[PDB]
Amino acid sequence: CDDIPRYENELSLRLVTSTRAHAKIKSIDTSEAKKVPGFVCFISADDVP
Amino acid sequence: HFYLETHCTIAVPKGEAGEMELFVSTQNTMKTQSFVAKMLGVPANRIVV
Amino acid sequence: EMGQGLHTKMVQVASRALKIPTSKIYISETSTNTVPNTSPTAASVSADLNGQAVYAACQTILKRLEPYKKKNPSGSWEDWVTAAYMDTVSLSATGFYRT
Amino acid sequence: ADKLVFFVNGRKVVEKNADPETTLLAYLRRKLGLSGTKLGCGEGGCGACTVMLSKYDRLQNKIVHFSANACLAPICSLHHVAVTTVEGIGSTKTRLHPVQERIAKSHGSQCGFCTPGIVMSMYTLLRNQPEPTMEEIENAFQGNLCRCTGYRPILQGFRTFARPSLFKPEEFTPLDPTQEPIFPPELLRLKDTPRKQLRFEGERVTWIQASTLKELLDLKAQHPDAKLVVGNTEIGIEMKFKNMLFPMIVCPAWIPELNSVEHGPDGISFGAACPLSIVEKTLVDAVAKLPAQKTEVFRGVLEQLRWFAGKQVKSVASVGGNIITASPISDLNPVFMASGAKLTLVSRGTRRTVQMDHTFFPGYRKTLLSPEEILLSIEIPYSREGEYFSAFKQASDIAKVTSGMRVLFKPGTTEVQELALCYGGMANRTISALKTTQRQLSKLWKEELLQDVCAGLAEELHLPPDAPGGMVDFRCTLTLSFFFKFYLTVLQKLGQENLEVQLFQEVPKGQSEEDMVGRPLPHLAADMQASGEAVYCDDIPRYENELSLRLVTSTRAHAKIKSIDTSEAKKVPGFVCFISADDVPGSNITGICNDETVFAKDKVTCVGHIIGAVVADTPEHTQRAAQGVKITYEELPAIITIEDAIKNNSFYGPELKIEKGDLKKGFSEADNVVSGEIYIGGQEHFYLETHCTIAVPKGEAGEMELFVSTQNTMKTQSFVAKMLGVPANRIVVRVKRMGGGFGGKETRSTVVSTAVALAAYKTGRPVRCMLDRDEDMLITGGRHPFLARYKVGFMKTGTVVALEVDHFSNVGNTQDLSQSIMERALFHMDNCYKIPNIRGTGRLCKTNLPSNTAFRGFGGPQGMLIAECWMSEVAVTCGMPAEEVRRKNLYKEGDLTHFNQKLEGFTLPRCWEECLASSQYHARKSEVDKFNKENCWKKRGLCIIPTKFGISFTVPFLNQAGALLHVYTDGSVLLTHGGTEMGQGLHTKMVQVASRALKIPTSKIYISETSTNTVPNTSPTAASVSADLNGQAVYAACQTILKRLEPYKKKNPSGSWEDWVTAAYMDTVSLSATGFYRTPNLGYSFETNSGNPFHYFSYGVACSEVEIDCLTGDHKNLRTDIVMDVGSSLNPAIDIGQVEGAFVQGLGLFTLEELHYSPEGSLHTRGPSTYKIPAFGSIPIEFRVSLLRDCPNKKAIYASKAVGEPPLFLAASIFFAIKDAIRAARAQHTGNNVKELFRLDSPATPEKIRNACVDKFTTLCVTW
Ligand SMILES: Cc1cc2nc3c(=O)[nH]c(=O)nc-3n(C[C@H](O)[C@H](O)[C@H](O)COP(=O)(O)OP(=O)(O)OC[C@H]3O[C@@H](n4cnc5c(N)ncnc54)[C@H](O)[C@@H]3O)c2cc1C
Ligand code: FES
Ligand code: FES
Structure with a gap:
C-alpha cells in the first residue's frame, strides 16, 4: 500500500490518543507542537464539516 | 490479529465537486465509502475506494 | 484479496465457463465503481458468492456469441470476437447472485 | 544581494536562489503548484497566461495595477512586486467573484481553457476604472483569444457592468469593490528602507538589477557585451525560439x-x-x-x-x-x-x-x-x-x-x-x-x-x-x-x-419543473472552469519521481539517415537517456492502415516525423538535451505540391467515383457551357490545450495507466498495447476533459502517447510530456486542401442540366482517415440542388508533407463550396438575380440524391423562406447598390446560402455505443458512457436525459470521467453523433433499472426514491447495470450505387453583409442572420453555442487563416503571431441566430437533431458576399467588362482581395 509512490506534495498524518480509561477532557494544548520543523496543522473534532 | 501489513490510507482529493479517491487496506469496501461520505457530508457518488 | 487465492479461484472458474485458457483472462483490482454495493469480503462465502456472479456474467457473454460460433464452428475464439464486434454486439456485461 | 522576495496571492515568497531563466508561470505553475494559469502559445499573443501585477510606485507615491502575461515575465524582474492570480479573486469553495460568475452563467465558457485568462483581463479593468464604457471593455480583449465560443456570449455577459429567453441577468450578484483583497501591508513597511543593486546567479546566466544611472553606466563601460533587458518581450522570444544565450544581463528599469x-x-x-x-x-x-x-x-x-x-x-x-x-x-x-x-x-x-x-x-x-x-x-x-x-x-x-x-x-x-x-x-x-x-x-x-x-x-x-x-x-x-x-x-x-439577438422555442405548458430536457441549463462545470478549479491535464500533479519527455524531429523533407550523435546531450545536467527506434520491444509499425512508424528507421519521409526522444528531469533540461542530439542525412528527391503528385503519378489507391444519368445527353441538350478550376486552402485546429500524456507504469504484469487528451479512447489503447507487445487488458486509458479537439485529436494523439508510454516502460517510473505551440503545429498537421476542375451545363432560365467535377485532396505521408474524407466530399457536391446527370471523381495524393487528418467538417465543407461557385457563375452568365436561381433548383420533398437516398421530411425550404423574412434581404439588397453608387473607394456585398449535411458515421459499424450506471445505497447515481467531453456539453446533455428517464432531479446524478474499463470498445468521440449514440445507451441502462424497481414502487407508490432503493437493496436486487445501442439499417455500396449511407440530414441557411476597403484589402463584417434546423433541441443554450462557434470557424477557413511552406517543404508558419485566427474584433457586427420551431425528428433520442458540424459551412455567405463587392469595384475602375468570370481562391485574405480590385495602381506593378 504505502508501496505506492508519493506525490510530490503529499503530507503524512499520525493521530493522538487517550492516555486514560474514562474521563472528562479539560483542555488541549497545541503550543509545544507548532515549534517542530515542517508542522502543518492539528485536526480535531471541531473540524469535520 | 497480527497480520503483517498493518492498517492504512492514501487519500487523494481531486478538488472539483467534492471528489476524492482512496487507496485502502480493507475487507469492507462499501462501508469504507459511506462512512467517509457521511463524515464529509457529501453524496456517495463522489467517493471512490 | 487478502492472500487466500480468491483471485486465482475467480480466474479458474471463468476460464472454464468460457472455455479459453487461464492465461488469456486478467483481474487487476477491486473497486466501488466497477461494481457497487458489495458485502464485506468475509465469512468464507466470499468464494461461492463471487463464484456465482462471475459465472452468470460469463454465460451472458456466451449467449451473445453463439450465432458467430455456429456460423464458423472450427475457427479461433479471436475469430468469433472480431466477428461479433463488426456485426454490432455488446462485449461488456454485468452479473449477479443471491443465496 | 541575493534573496528575491515577492508576493503571490497575499502570501510572501522568499526564494533564496533564483535562476534568471525561470519564467513567472512555471514558478507559479510548478513550484507553488497553482494550476489554472494556463500555457497557450508561450509566444505572447493568446493571453491564457494572464495575471495581475500590483506594485507601489515611489515616483508618484501611488499604488498601481496592471495585466501582464506571465509566460514571458522572468522572475528576476519581479522583486517586491505582488501577484494576483485566477485563484486569487474567488472560488467555489467560498464565493465566486462576480467577474467569475457572470462569465459562467451567461454561457461564455464551453471548453473552458481560455477562461481564467479572460477573467483576469476583465478583473483588472475594473480595478482601474470601476464603471467602464462598452468601448473600453471591447478592448481589454485584443490580448485574449477563444476558439470554441465565437465571442458573443462573453461580451453580452459582461456588457452588464457598464455605463422566450436564455439567462437572467437580473439575478446576478452585485459587487462591492470595497471587498477585493488588500495591498499587502508588508511591502509599504519596505518602501522607505532604499534600493541597492542586486545580483542573482543562475545555471547559465547572471542577472544584475541596477539601481542608480551611475551604476548602469559603469557596468556597461567595463563589460560592453552585457545585455540590457527591460520588458523582455523581445529577448524572451529570442532565447526560447532561436536558441540564443546571452550570459550576462543587466536590467535598468528601476532608474528614475x-x-x-x-x-x-x-x-x-x-x-x-x-x-x-x-x-x-x-x-x-x-x-x-x-x-x-x-x-x-x-x-x-x-x-x-x-x-x-x-x-x-x-x-x-x-x-x-x-x-x-x-x-x-x-x-x-x-x-x-x-x-x-x-x-x-x-x-x-x-x-x-x-x-x-x-x-x-x-x-x-x-x-x-x-x-x-x-x-x-x-x-x-x-x-x-x-x-x-x-x-x-x-x-x-x-x-x-x-x-x-x-x-x-x-x-x-x-x-x-x-x-x-x-x-x-x-x-x-x-x-x-x-x-x-x-x-x-x-x-x-x-x-x-x-x-x-x-x-x-x-x-x-x-x-x-x-x-x-x-x-x-x-x-x-x-x-x-x-x-x-x-x-x-x-x-x-x-x-x-x-x-x-438569438431565439428558440419554449417547453410545453404542462412539463415538470425538474424535467430539464429542452430547457437551457448551463454546462455542468462552467463555474469551476471559470474559477480555476477544473483540472485539465499536466494540471494533474507530479509524482515525486516523474520524468519529462520531449521528442526529436526531422529537419529534412525526404532523405536517408546516415547516423545519430548523442554526445553533446549527455553533458546536460539531469539528462536521463535517449529513446529510439531500436528500443520498442513490440512492433514499430503502427498507424491506422498500418502505413507509419512509431520511430523512424533508416529514412525520413516528411518535414519531420519522429526520429526519437530525450528524457530528463525538467522540461527546460528537456529542451537543452533535444538540442544536443545532432543527426547526418543524405538527401533523396521530394514530391510536395498537389501537381508533382500527378505529374509523377503518385498516390494512395484507385480513383473514387460516383455516377447517375448520362450526361452525354446533357451538354448536347444544353444552352451554355462553363468550365473553370479553383483552389481551397488548408487549415489548423488551434485548440487551446495542445496534445499530451502522463503515462504511469505499475510494474507487475505489464500494467500501465495513461492520462490522455484524446477523442479516441480505443485506439489510444490498442496501438499502445501493440507497440509494447502485451494483451489489451493490461492497458487502461482515461480522459476526464479536453481543451478542445475538433478532429485534430481523433487519431493523432496517439503519436505522442505512444512515445511517452515506452519511456515509462524503459525507465520504470512515470513520465509525462505536453507539446509547445510550435512543436504541435508542425508534427500533428492540418485539414486537407483541395484542387477541383469543373464543367457545368445549363439553360438560359438558369435551370441546370449536367455537371462534371474532379477532386484532389493533398494527403501527406501516411494514409490515415484520408479516404473516408474524400468519400464524404463526394456525398456533398450537390449541396442542395437536384441535377439529373452528374459525374464526380477524386484522387488521393502522396506527398512529403506531414499527414493531414480529421477536422470539423470531414471534407464536406469543401465544396459544397465547389458547386456553389460554379453556381453563382451560372446566375451571372444568365443575368441574374442570384436568389431566383438557387430557389429555382432545390431538391423538393421526397426527391432523391445522386446516391439514390430518399429526402424525407425535408425542412430546407421552410428554413429558406423563414430566413429571407426576418433578415429582410430585399430591401437590404436595394439599400446596398446605392452605397455602391455613392462610394468610389469602399463597396458592399450581400449573400444568402443553403446547406444539408448527412448525419452518421460512414463505416456503418461505428454507429454504436454503450454505458454503465450504478445506484448507491444512499440514493445517489453514478453515470459513465462511452464518449468524451471536449467542451460541447456532452456530459450536460447525458445528465439531462438520464434525469428525465429516471424521474429524479438533475442535481442527484453525477458523471466523473470517461474510461476503458468502465465501458470498453468505444467509437471515436466524433461525427456529431456522439450525442445520439450515447444518448441511447444511457437510456437503455436507465430502463433496465426502472424495471428492477417497479415491484417496490408498486408496494409503496407514494414514498421517496431513497425509499424504493433501501428497499430493493434489502430484498436483493441488482443496482448496477449496462446499456447499449446500434443505428439500424445502414450501408451504402459504391458499385451498385444503392443502399443507405446516412440516418437523417441537418439543414440550415445564412445571410451576410460585408463592406470592403478597396484601397487596402481589409473588410468589416457588417451583419449575419442564420436559421437552423436542430429538431427539438435537448438544450438550446448549448446548441447555438454550438451554432455560433462552428460559424465563426468557417469565418477563419474562408477568409483569415493561411498556412506557408518553404519551396522545399518545411512549414514556415508556427504561432498566434503568423497564424491569425479570428479575434473578438472579427465577428459580425450584428449577429442573429434562430433555431427552427415545431419540427420533431423521430429518428433520434427524444426528438433532437445533431448539431456539431453542419453549420460551419454557412460562413460561405461571407465569402460570396465578399466576391460580390469585388464585382462592384471591378466594374467602376475596369472601365467596362460585360459579365466577368474571375478566379477567386479560398481563403480570401487582404492580399487576394486587394490584388483582384483592379485600377490605376495595380497596373503600375504589372510591367519563399
Ligand atoms: C505579443 C506581441 C505583439 C507585438 N506587436 C508588435 C507590434 O504590433 N508592432 C511592433 O512594432 N512591435 C510589436 N511587438 C514588439 C514589442 O513592441 C517590443 O518587444 C517592445 O517594443 C520591446 O520593449 P522591451 O522592454 O521588451 O525590450 P526587451 O525585450 O527587454 O529587449 C529589447 C531590446 O532593447 C534593448 N535596449 C538597448 N538599449 C536599450 C536602452 N537604451 N534602453 C532600453 N532597452 C534597450 C535590448 O538590447 C533589447 O534588444 C510585439 C511583441 C509581442 C510579443
Ligand atoms: S501569451 Fe502565454 S500562452 Fe499565449
Ligand atoms: S472555451 Fe475558449 S478555447 Fe474553448
Missing part, C-alpha cells in the same frame, strides 16, 4: 532618469524604459487638451498604437525596446523617422544628440549606437503651422507594410518646403522616400505631383520576384495606395475638393 516624462517648449520627452502603455495615456489626453495643430504627430503615434498588440504587452514593453530592437516591421520606427524624432544617447563621459533619419539604421537589426552607449530618451515633436501627418499599417522579418508620412508648406500657401515618406517592411530596415521625395520639392499639391510620386514609388522600391516574404505586387501596390490615401486627406485640410 529612464522613466521620466517631461513637457518641453517643443515636444514631449519620454524615458526609454517607459511602457508603451504610458506613452499612450500621455498623448491620449494631452491631444484632447491642446490646439489641434501642434498635435499632428501625436495623432499618428496613437494611430499606430491601437492596432499594436493589446494590453498585457503594452503594459510591459518600452518605447526604448522597440526603437533599438530594431525589426524591419516596427510600426513605430517609420513614424519616428518620418517625424524626424530626437534621441538622447549616453555612455560614461558621452552626451550625443541625434535627429532620427535614414542614417540611423545601417544594416540588419543594427543602429548608430556604440557598444558602451545606452539610449536615454526619445522626444516626439509638436507640429508647426501648416505641417501635416498620417500613419498607415496594414495587416491580416518581412511583409505587410507600415508607414509614416510628413509634409510642410511654404507658409500661408500650398507649395512644399519639406517632404518625407518612410516605409516599414519593404526592405532590410526602416527606409526613406528619398529620390522621389527630392524631385517633388517646391511644386504644388496638385494632380501631376500625385502622378510623379507614384511613378517614383514604383521604380525606387522595386521588388525582385525572389525577394523574401513573397506576395510581391500586394506588397507593392500598398506603397502607392497609402500615398494616395495620404494625398487626399491633405487636401481635405485646406481648400478641399467638394462637389455637393
Whole structure:
C-alpha cells in the first residue's frame, strides 16, 4: 500500500490518543507542537464539516 | 490479529465537486465509502475506494 | 484479496465457463465503481458468492456469441470476437447472485 | 544581494536562489503548484497566461495595477512586486467573484481553457476604472483569444457592468469593490528602507538589477557585451525560439532618469524604459487638451498604437525596446523617422544628440549606437503651422507594410518646403522616400505631383520576384495606395475638393419543473472552469519521481539517415537517456492502415516525423538535451505540391467515383457551357490545450495507466498495447476533459502517447510530456486542401442540366482517415440542388508533407463550396438575380440524391423562406447598390446560402455505443458512457436525459470521467453523433433499472426514491447495470450505387453583409442572420453555442487563416503571431441566430437533431458576399467588362482581395 509512490506534495498524518480509561477532557494544548520543523496543522473534532 | 501489513490510507482529493479517491487496506469496501461520505457530508457518488 | 487465492479461484472458474485458457483472462483490482454495493469480503462465502456472479456474467457473454460460433464452428475464439464486434454486439456485461 | 522576495496571492515568497531563466508561470505553475494559469502559445499573443501585477510606485507615491502575461515575465524582474492570480479573486469553495460568475452563467465558457485568462483581463479593468464604457471593455480583449465560443456570449455577459429567453441577468450578484483583497501591508513597511543593486546567479546566466544611472553606466563601460533587458518581450522570444544565450544581463528599469516624462517648449520627452502603455495615456489626453495643430504627430503615434498588440504587452514593453530592437516591421520606427524624432544617447563621459533619419539604421537589426552607449530618451515633436501627418499599417522579418508620412508648406500657401515618406517592411530596415521625395520639392499639391510620386514609388522600391516574404505586387501596390490615401486627406485640410439577438422555442405548458430536457441549463462545470478549479491535464500533479519527455524531429523533407550523435546531450545536467527506434520491444509499425512508424528507421519521409526522444528531469533540461542530439542525412528527391503528385503519378489507391444519368445527353441538350478550376486552402485546429500524456507504469504484469487528451479512447489503447507487445487488458486509458479537439485529436494523439508510454516502460517510473505551440503545429498537421476542375451545363432560365467535377485532396505521408474524407466530399457536391446527370471523381495524393487528418467538417465543407461557385457563375452568365436561381433548383420533398437516398421530411425550404423574412434581404439588397453608387473607394456585398449535411458515421459499424450506471445505497447515481467531453456539453446533455428517464432531479446524478474499463470498445468521440449514440445507451441502462424497481414502487407508490432503493437493496436486487445501442439499417455500396449511407440530414441557411476597403484589402463584417434546423433541441443554450462557434470557424477557413511552406517543404508558419485566427474584433457586427420551431425528428433520442458540424459551412455567405463587392469595384475602375468570370481562391485574405480590385495602381506593378 504505502508501496505506492508519493506525490510530490503529499503530507503524512499520525493521530493522538487517550492516555486514560474514562474521563472528562479539560483542555488541549497545541503550543509545544507548532515549534517542530515542517508542522502543518492539528485536526480535531471541531473540524469535520 | 497480527497480520503483517498493518492498517492504512492514501487519500487523494481531486478538488472539483467534492471528489476524492482512496487507496485502502480493507475487507469492507462499501462501508469504507459511506462512512467517509457521511463524515464529509457529501453524496456517495463522489467517493471512490 | 487478502492472500487466500480468491483471485486465482475467480480466474479458474471463468476460464472454464468460457472455455479459453487461464492465461488469456486478467483481474487487476477491486473497486466501488466497477461494481457497487458489495458485502464485506468475509465469512468464507466470499468464494461461492463471487463464484456465482462471475459465472452468470460469463454465460451472458456466451449467449451473445453463439450465432458467430455456429456460423464458423472450427475457427479461433479471436475469430468469433472480431466477428461479433463488426456485426454490432455488446462485449461488456454485468452479473449477479443471491443465496 | 541575493534573496528575491515577492508576493503571490497575499502570501510572501522568499526564494533564496533564483535562476534568471525561470519564467513567472512555471514558478507559479510548478513550484507553488497553482494550476489554472494556463500555457497557450508561450509566444505572447493568446493571453491564457494572464495575471495581475500590483506594485507601489515611489515616483508618484501611488499604488498601481496592471495585466501582464506571465509566460514571458522572468522572475528576476519581479522583486517586491505582488501577484494576483485566477485563484486569487474567488472560488467555489467560498464565493465566486462576480467577474467569475457572470462569465459562467451567461454561457461564455464551453471548453473552458481560455477562461481564467479572460477573467483576469476583465478583473483588472475594473480595478482601474470601476464603471467602464462598452468601448473600453471591447478592448481589454485584443490580448485574449477563444476558439470554441465565437465571442458573443462573453461580451453580452459582461456588457452588464457598464455605463422566450436564455439567462437572467437580473439575478446576478452585485459587487462591492470595497471587498477585493488588500495591498499587502508588508511591502509599504519596505518602501522607505532604499534600493541597492542586486545580483542573482543562475545555471547559465547572471542577472544584475541596477539601481542608480551611475551604476548602469559603469557596468556597461567595463563589460560592453552585457545585455540590457527591460520588458523582455523581445529577448524572451529570442532565447526560447532561436536558441540564443546571452550570459550576462543587466536590467535598468528601476532608474528614475529612464522613466521620466517631461513637457518641453517643443515636444514631449519620454524615458526609454517607459511602457508603451504610458506613452499612450500621455498623448491620449494631452491631444484632447491642446490646439489641434501642434498635435499632428501625436495623432499618428496613437494611430499606430491601437492596432499594436493589446494590453498585457503594452503594459510591459518600452518605447526604448522597440526603437533599438530594431525589426524591419516596427510600426513605430517609420513614424519616428518620418517625424524626424530626437534621441538622447549616453555612455560614461558621452552626451550625443541625434535627429532620427535614414542614417540611423545601417544594416540588419543594427543602429548608430556604440557598444558602451545606452539610449536615454526619445522626444516626439509638436507640429508647426501648416505641417501635416498620417500613419498607415496594414495587416491580416518581412511583409505587410507600415508607414509614416510628413509634409510642410511654404507658409500661408500650398507649395512644399519639406517632404518625407518612410516605409516599414519593404526592405532590410526602416527606409526613406528619398529620390522621389527630392524631385517633388517646391511644386504644388496638385494632380501631376500625385502622378510623379507614384511613378517614383514604383521604380525606387522595386521588388525582385525572389525577394523574401513573397506576395510581391500586394506588397507593392500598398506603397502607392497609402500615398494616395495620404494625398487626399491633405487636401481635405485646406481648400478641399467638394462637389455637393438569438431565439428558440419554449417547453410545453404542462412539463415538470425538474424535467430539464429542452430547457437551457448551463454546462455542468462552467463555474469551476471559470474559477480555476477544473483540472485539465499536466494540471494533474507530479509524482515525486516523474520524468519529462520531449521528442526529436526531422529537419529534412525526404532523405536517408546516415547516423545519430548523442554526445553533446549527455553533458546536460539531469539528462536521463535517449529513446529510439531500436528500443520498442513490440512492433514499430503502427498507424491506422498500418502505413507509419512509431520511430523512424533508416529514412525520413516528411518535414519531420519522429526520429526519437530525450528524457530528463525538467522540461527546460528537456529542451537543452533535444538540442544536443545532432543527426547526418543524405538527401533523396521530394514530391510536395498537389501537381508533382500527378505529374509523377503518385498516390494512395484507385480513383473514387460516383455516377447517375448520362450526361452525354446533357451538354448536347444544353444552352451554355462553363468550365473553370479553383483552389481551397488548408487549415489548423488551434485548440487551446495542445496534445499530451502522463503515462504511469505499475510494474507487475505489464500494467500501465495513461492520462490522455484524446477523442479516441480505443485506439489510444490498442496501438499502445501493440507497440509494447502485451494483451489489451493490461492497458487502461482515461480522459476526464479536453481543451478542445475538433478532429485534430481523433487519431493523432496517439503519436505522442505512444512515445511517452515506452519511456515509462524503459525507465520504470512515470513520465509525462505536453507539446509547445510550435512543436504541435508542425508534427500533428492540418485539414486537407483541395484542387477541383469543373464543367457545368445549363439553360438560359438558369435551370441546370449536367455537371462534371474532379477532386484532389493533398494527403501527406501516411494514409490515415484520408479516404473516408474524400468519400464524404463526394456525398456533398450537390449541396442542395437536384441535377439529373452528374459525374464526380477524386484522387488521393502522396506527398512529403506531414499527414493531414480529421477536422470539423470531414471534407464536406469543401465544396459544397465547389458547386456553389460554379453556381453563382451560372446566375451571372444568365443575368441574374442570384436568389431566383438557387430557389429555382432545390431538391423538393421526397426527391432523391445522386446516391439514390430518399429526402424525407425535408425542412430546407421552410428554413429558406423563414430566413429571407426576418433578415429582410430585399430591401437590404436595394439599400446596398446605392452605397455602391455613392462610394468610389469602399463597396458592399450581400449573400444568402443553403446547406444539408448527412448525419452518421460512414463505416456503418461505428454507429454504436454503450454505458454503465450504478445506484448507491444512499440514493445517489453514478453515470459513465462511452464518449468524451471536449467542451460541447456532452456530459450536460447525458445528465439531462438520464434525469428525465429516471424521474429524479438533475442535481442527484453525477458523471466523473470517461474510461476503458468502465465501458470498453468505444467509437471515436466524433461525427456529431456522439450525442445520439450515447444518448441511447444511457437510456437503455436507465430502463433496465426502472424495471428492477417497479415491484417496490408498486408496494409503496407514494414514498421517496431513497425509499424504493433501501428497499430493493434489502430484498436483493441488482443496482448496477449496462446499456447499449446500434443505428439500424445502414450501408451504402459504391458499385451498385444503392443502399443507405446516412440516418437523417441537418439543414440550415445564412445571410451576410460585408463592406470592403478597396484601397487596402481589409473588410468589416457588417451583419449575419442564420436559421437552423436542430429538431427539438435537448438544450438550446448549448446548441447555438454550438451554432455560433462552428460559424465563426468557417469565418477563419474562408477568409483569415493561411498556412506557408518553404519551396522545399518545411512549414514556415508556427504561432498566434503568423497564424491569425479570428479575434473578438472579427465577428459580425450584428449577429442573429434562430433555431427552427415545431419540427420533431423521430429518428433520434427524444426528438433532437445533431448539431456539431453542419453549420460551419454557412460562413460561405461571407465569402460570396465578399466576391460580390469585388464585382462592384471591378466594374467602376475596369472601365467596362460585360459579365466577368474571375478566379477567386479560398481563403480570401487582404492580399487576394486587394490584388483582384483592379485600377490605376495595380497596373503600375504589372510591367519563399
Ligand atoms: C505579443 C506581441 C505583439 C507585438 N506587436 C508588435 C507590434 O504590433 N508592432 C511592433 O512594432 N512591435 C510589436 N511587438 C514588439 C514589442 O513592441 C517590443 O518587444 C517592445 O517594443 C520591446 O520593449 P522591451 O522592454 O521588451 O525590450 P526587451 O525585450 O527587454 O529587449 C529589447 C531590446 O532593447 C534593448 N535596449 C538597448 N538599449 C536599450 C536602452 N537604451 N534602453 C532600453 N532597452 C534597450 C535590448 O538590447 C533589447 O534588444 C510585439 C511583441 C509581442 C510579443
Ligand atoms: S501569451 Fe502565454 S500562452 Fe499565449
Ligand atoms: S472555451 Fe475558449 S478555447 Fe474553448
